[PDB]
Amino acid sequence: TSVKVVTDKCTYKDNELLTKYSYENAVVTKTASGRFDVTPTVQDYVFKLDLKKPEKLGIMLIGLGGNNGSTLVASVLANKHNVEFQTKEGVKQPNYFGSMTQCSTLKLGIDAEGNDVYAPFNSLLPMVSPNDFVVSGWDINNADLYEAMQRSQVLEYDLQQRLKAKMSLVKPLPSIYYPDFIAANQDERANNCINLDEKGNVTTRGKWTHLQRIRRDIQNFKEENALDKVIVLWTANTERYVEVSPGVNDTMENLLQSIKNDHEEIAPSTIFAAASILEGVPYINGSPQNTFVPGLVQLAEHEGTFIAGDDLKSGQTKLKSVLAQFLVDAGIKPVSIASYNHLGNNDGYNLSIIASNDILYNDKLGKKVDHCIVIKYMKPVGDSKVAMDEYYSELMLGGHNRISIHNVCEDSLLATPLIIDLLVMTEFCTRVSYKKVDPVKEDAGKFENFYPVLTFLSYWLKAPLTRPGFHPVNGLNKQRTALENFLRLLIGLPSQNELRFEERLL
Template identity: 45%
Template sequence: VTPRDTEVHFRTERSKPRLGCMLVGWGGNNGSTVTAALLANKMNMSWHTKEGEKRANFYGSLTQASTTCLGTGPDGRDIYIPFMDMLPMVDPGEIAVDGWDICSDDLAVAMEKAAVLNWNLQQKLKPHLKKLQPRASIYRKDFIAANQEANTERFCSVEKGLNDTADVLLNSIKRNAAEVSASTLFAVASILEGCSFVNGSPQNTFVPGVIDLAEQKGVPISGDDFKSGQTKVKSVLVDFLVNAGIKPVSIVSYNHLGNNDGMNLSAPKQFCSKEISKSNVVDDMSNKILYPDGKKPDHCFNKETFLLTSYSIRTLLFLGYSTCKNPLGISTYYI
């Protein structure tokens, strides 16, 4: 290997473009929660709980609540600034949100059904969310899940003549092939419109034909499950251990879920998508020194449904929670 230095000059556009975000499953728990959070912060809302007054914030957001190292000062100390001040970024309150759902409820009804946000906050948001109605979505019963963003479809088959190339996939869509999933249809539509597509679910939305089409059109696509909770913690811990020269040989985890995600994952085909995604999350971190035989950590993921737990996860995130509701953790990933 020969080191090479290349001096690069680049200029960042200072003007901030308008940004729109369309959510597949907008009327679900995550879609209604992220929309409510954007509105609550835009309107600087506050509400009362038994612990006192709470005020909307962006805790948990990478762009709005984290810092980055700008450089070193004259005294040799690192200087950190808010991430959002490093580059011109769109104000989250100015994001235009829209989307689709197989349920026709407006966002106010969806928020109430989700039962994620404090009741007093819901009452303040209700008049604003009542005006927001999801567009009619794609209904494919064989792939159906509780909600699409950050939830789970079953894996679809990857077959030659079905979805192995862009042209083959487009032909499969034209003839309404049953094994083309709804998430793949949305991804293809987004690419054809020249819009970036982010997949927040663990199923194989990006079949070879979708990747081929995105490369042909020059459209960015990304995402393989948001991994916002337990999986994120495991990723951080394993990365720390491996970088310290410690070899994890086995990881066994349990998810206790009482929400729609839990009920959705009770279906074997849907659970398979999640199991593959979670089990493989630590594989990329293993190195050839600790694992010379090419083996990976023995990683087992289990899921049990307990209705009483609902969405509860202990953490501290935006909108004033010390007991995190699962959609709150996922919503910060959007922002």
């Protein structure tokens, strides 16, 4: 499918789309007798979109041999090659269910009877297909992707067998292993490392050489596959937070020298992110550690390359967000949120809204929500994960409400389509540039790319890497709306209002 809007806001020229958009917002000021003084603001923009998308997109994953990496490669091959497979429920055709860019829809408007008309999320503007991903990456373990699948226990046995021949040919590149950064148990899995000494052992020495090695890898992968575009994504084991100290990783220059100095606060991801930036390739952090120290963020700004992330947002987390928001929107006051969960995969083994509502949360009836988060490792559960979150909330006149959400599913089958989403949306953003219109000075403007931090990806990240003078904004619903309204405006359509006046009125 394809979409064509009749608008005077858009002009297509030589695989290039120019769109006018007037951004409206409002600045508020509450004071005195509690009066909210709101002053609307307007800012006109011109968006430019390279309509020409990569025929093939290179993807390089750190942790390629794990559950997510294994599964991501399997899904691209299975789908690209229409690899149907046998299950106890019969033959099945591959798909990308769980992917918003591949399997969700957006409301374009209404037809003749006044009913909504939805179109595929990726049918509005040109987006790259996961079927066109050319995937590679690094892993401290040398097992090929077929062996990786076997070890992960995520995919149907018969699907692994039909993909055996191809997955066996995929081997992860050696990686950077600095033992002290991951969960104890690891020196055994690590058997494919570049950072070796004269005798071929450990070594956290030569971090800048490691950095160079990684940059060569990116250059090699790019040329050997005749790839113009490449994106890097960390989906490896969570590392132990790095301390942010002045003079070391506080600035571009400082960080860069610290790496050269083989400093203790220079983790493997730090080098991967730095190497990607230096190569000009977008870098996404799918783990919770804080690799985006202030010195790295400056580097990206300096280089003018995109970065994003900090922990892939799990399904349970999303649901929690949606659920908590719903209660509050309805004026329900949650007092506690007991969250629990346990899995038996390597991820867990390694791991082995009050502000918006002062009516409910204030200094008279309570401003806090007692909530605990427990994550246990239960090996016999496998990739399958069991999450349970309970909400005990206050209702009117001394009443209470207890809601329990139980969730069971193979974690990696949820994570892989989200990785696909992060990759497709990241590529899409790279082809987007803009320029703010100066009311007074007609021209002179020059297009620019988004701020080096792609917050448009917050939908898929648990802890959004916040830009300096602003606070992170989660709220899953608010996050999809933004993405939806962005595609909309690029094609000359206004944000969704839900007013349906062609029904409520006259």
